[PDB]
Design a protein around this nucleic acid. Structure first.
Ligand SMILES: [Mg+2]
Ligand SMILES: [Mg+2]
Ligand SMILES: [Mg+2]
Ligand SMILES: [Mg+2]
Ligand SMILES: [Mg+2]
Ligand SMILES: [Mg+2]
Ligand SMILES: [Mg+2]
Ligand SMILES: [Mg+2]
Lengths: 131, 273, 93, 87, 64
RNA sequence: AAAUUC
RNA sequence: GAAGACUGGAGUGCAGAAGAGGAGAGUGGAAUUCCACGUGUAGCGGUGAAAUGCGUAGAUAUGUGGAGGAACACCAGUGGCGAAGGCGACUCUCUGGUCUGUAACUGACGCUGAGGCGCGAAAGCGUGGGGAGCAAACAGGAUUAGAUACCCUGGUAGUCCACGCCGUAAACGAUGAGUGCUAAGUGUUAGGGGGUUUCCGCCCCUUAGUGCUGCAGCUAACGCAUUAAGCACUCCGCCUGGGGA
């Protein structure tokens, strides 16, 4: 969290995915909140709980695996990096893995996945890819 | 230390001189001054015997205690002065007796220190003791060769001797040139090295500065005439066309020993330089 | 700060003189900026090696309270000059 | 600096009774140490290792100054005069 | 094994206790290593400084 | 002891 | 961007710990060399063999004392400290940094950092001291077909100290700085905490260093593997066939 607490957040998911862990916790923030809720809407996360603390609270995330020991979140990549910010126009929002994946966009009407941002015709900074 | 000179003119290009950081006063005691007259190497009969002398800045002799027989009376250093007759600075001492006299300034001696001498003095710079009482190995100066005559062996600037061992009635000594010698144990000496140790690093840098000090030009021999020097003559430049280089009076002058072969004092010299 | 002194006096000193140097040596410490807590002597003690032509000697132990620290340096200067004390060491406490 | 010397300094710069890390109290002490060390580094000029510690302190003094100069310009323009520094 | 200092309750050091210090010096006067005397690692430095400072003031021989 | 080249 | 709020980052306070960190002055003991004096006789030294060398002006050896210089036996330990070069005798004076515990205080005061400024082994240079060993150059004896070398006897600059330059190295962990995350096992350095436990001693928890063995992962391979060369973010330096260079 030295510079980018979203790039770190994605990494903390990927590291614990590789070693087949089950739960993981990390300090909470308003932007970290819904980015963790979106992943619940597509089953990428088993469930999420919030914790209230003295400094800012933390967020506990229950990662999900399919039976037969197959991972569900197979990777994450960041696009808006603090060293180089990227913005995408409405018609030029990409599709990840021909629509199998999901992307996160911080449009003008709250953080939104591009399934409906293209349906709502808005663009904004592109936060991450998930696939 | 040494005061170098910026290269203003060609005569000042290399000249260096001492800065006199140590001389305290510049007014000699008027009661210890005796006149001198230059002699320019002129003989008893008015002839010129030792050449290349005479014709310098005038000076004034200033009496110096080379005996230090005033025993047991505390003496105090009053100043360190400049003396033109020698290569070392000198110091003015006023004993509690009220008398004043000059002594040679040994290295490390500074104004305020108190000097004793005799047969009960301690071992410190400036104290005068017989070689009988001097512990072996110490560094001394101003030795003397006959009991009671006065200091005569080590006197120039920044030089020292070393008591090397006692052999009964005599005492072994290593002199400055490196010649180990034997002298009577009732003679005297002064502990410590002589003061002005940097006197030998000075560039004269000018002919005029040579002549300010009572020195006159030296002419080589190869440019003289055949009747004037065993080398003079020959057309053009000529080498030393002789068996050996010669002084203006025969008597070869390079590698030729000239000590008297039948001297009385061979048995007091353990080894030469 | 806290200091401590321990010096050695030649055995060939008659007890009249050996009781005088202690007043002299302890004189400087009180004279300059320091205060002495006590001055005790162990007594005669054999030396593990012949420091000088000697073989035996006397021992002493002194405690101080000083702040300007110049008293110790004055004690150091007189120690080497004197011909009585052969070895002396200063330890901080 | 002794511990007791510092507690004399801090009592002359605190805002309320027990603050100990406000920029002005934090810089009042460091300036005293910097002045103290320079008089101890202008005698022994070959102590290169210890001289570096002086550079860190003046580096840590300057960073706090720009804090005041962007937080309260009036306060900073006042502190210098009392402390006798420059810009 | 077992450090005497770490066990026998002796915590401080004074360079006057020559008799106690003599247990840690060899026959020829050398300092024993750690592997034979069993002293703790920390007190070894306390002991090593103690002997040397005494060894200067004639309480123990340099070479015996 | 040292003791090269194809 | 503006205004305001918060304490984890960063820093101060408070209580402790260890340290060949540094500058200056003073001091110590073994040992090589030299000098002086006793005892005593023909050799001592050196190599693969030998010779040069030193000795009957009396050597080598041996006892007593004096002088000078340089480095610090044991402790000593993939131990400590420092940003890197580097730092071992002892004492004192003047100084720098680091770690643990507390939650008293400030409230993002942070990280990197082109140009710029400093420090930088050894050799080398200038001025000046000093000079015990060792030792470029060089001389002598050897070796060999030749031996400007390796071997042997000497030996100048130097090695050391003060002031001023040089600014380089396999200056190497051949691994830029900062931050977070990802199985274990076992040593060792300085700490804190608990259990057992009258103590001592044993067991357990934790922080910061320092070694080794090893999963997931990486790599071309060797190997790295919580002290990453694994998974990520910020900033800096550098590379684009070999020679020419
Ligand atoms: Mg002449
Ligand atoms: Mg002519
Ligand atoms: Mg001709
Ligand atoms: Mg001729
Ligand atoms: Mg630069
Ligand atoms: Mg050098
Ligand atoms: Mg040789
Ligand atoms: Mg560790």
């Amino acid at each position: 969290v030295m510079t980018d607490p979203i790039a770190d957040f994605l990494t903390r998911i990927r590291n614990a995915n590789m070693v087949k862990h089950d739960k993981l916790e990390l300090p909470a923030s308003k932007i970290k909140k819904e980015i963790a809720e979106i992943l619940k809407r597509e089953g990428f996360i088993r469930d999420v709980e919030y914790i209230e603390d003295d400094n800012a609270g933390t967020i506990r995330v229950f990662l999900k695996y399919g039976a037969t020991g197959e991972r569900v979140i197979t990777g994450l990549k960041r696009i808006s990096k603090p060293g180089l910010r990227v913005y995408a126009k409405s018609t030029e929002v990409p599709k990840v893995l021909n629509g199998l994946g999901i992307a996160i966009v911080s449009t003008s009407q709250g953080v939104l996945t591009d399934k409906e941002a293209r349906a709502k015709q808005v663009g904004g900074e592109v936060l991450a890819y998930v696939w | 230390a040494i005061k170098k000179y910026k290269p203003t003119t060609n005569g000042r290009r290399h000249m260096t001189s001492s800065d006199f950081a140590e001389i305290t006063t510049s007014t000699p005691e008027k009661s210890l001054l005796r006149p001198l007259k230059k002699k320019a190497g002129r003989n008893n009969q008015g002839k010129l015997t030792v050449r290349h002398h005479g014709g310098g800045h005038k000076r004034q002799y200033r009496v110096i205690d080379f005996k230090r027989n005033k025993d047991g009376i505390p003496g105090r250093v009053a100043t360190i002065e400049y003396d033109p007759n020698r290569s070392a600075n000198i110091a003015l001492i006023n004993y509690a007796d009220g008398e004043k006299r000059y002594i040679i300034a040994a290295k490390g001696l500074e104004v305020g220190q108190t000097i004793y001498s005799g047969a009960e003095a301690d071992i410190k710079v400036g104290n005068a003791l017989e070689l009988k009482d001097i512990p072996v190995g110490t560094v001394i100066h101003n030795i003397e060769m006959k009991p009671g005559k006065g200091g005569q062996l080590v006197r120039s600037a920044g030089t020292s001797a070393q008591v090397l061992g006692k052999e009964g009635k005599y005492v072994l000594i290593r002199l400055n040139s490196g010649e180990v010698r034997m002298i009577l144990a009732t003679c005297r000496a002064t502990i410590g090295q002589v003061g002005n140790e940097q006197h030998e690093l000075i560039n004269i840098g000018k002919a005029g500065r040579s002549r300010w000090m009572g020195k006159r030009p030296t002419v080589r021999g190869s440019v003289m005439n055949p009747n004037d020097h065993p080398h003079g003559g020959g057309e053009g430049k000529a080498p030393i066309g002789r068996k050996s280089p010669m002084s203006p009076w025969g008597k070869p002058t390079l590698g030729y020993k000239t000590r008297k072969k039948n001297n009385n004092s061979d048995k007091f010299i353990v080894r030469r330089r | 700060r806290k200091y401590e002194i321990m010096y050695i006096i030649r055995p060939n000193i008659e007890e009249d003189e050996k009781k005088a140097v202690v007043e002299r040596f302890d004189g400087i410490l009180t004279e300059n900026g320091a205060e002495i807590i006590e001055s005790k002597e162990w007594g005669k003690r054999r030396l593990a090696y012949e420091i000088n032509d000697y073989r035996d000697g006397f021992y002493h132990i002194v405690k101080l309270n000083a702040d300007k620290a110049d008293s110790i340096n004055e004690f150091d200067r007189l120690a080497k000059i004197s011909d009585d004390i052969v070895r002396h060491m200063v330890i901080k406490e | 600096l002794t511990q007791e010397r510092k507690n004399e300094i801090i009592a002359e710069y605190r805002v309320h009774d027990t603050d100990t890390g406000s920029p002005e109290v934090q810089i009042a002490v460091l300036t005293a140490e910097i002045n103290s060390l320079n008089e101890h580094v202008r005698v022994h000029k070959k102590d290169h290792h210890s001289y570096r510690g002086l550079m860190k302190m003046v580096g840590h003094r300057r960073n706090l100054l720009t804090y005041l100069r962007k937080k309260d310009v009036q306060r900073y323009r006042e502190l210098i005069k009392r402390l006798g520094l420059r810009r | 094994k077992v450090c005497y200092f770490t066990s026998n309750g002796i915590t401080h050091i004074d360079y006057k206790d020559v008799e106690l210090l003599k247990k840690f010096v060899s026959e020829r006067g050398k300092i024993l290593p750690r592997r034979v005397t069993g002293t703790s690692a920390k007190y070894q430095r306390k002991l090593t400084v103690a002997i040397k400072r005494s060894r200067q003031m004639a309480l123990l021989p340099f070479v015996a």
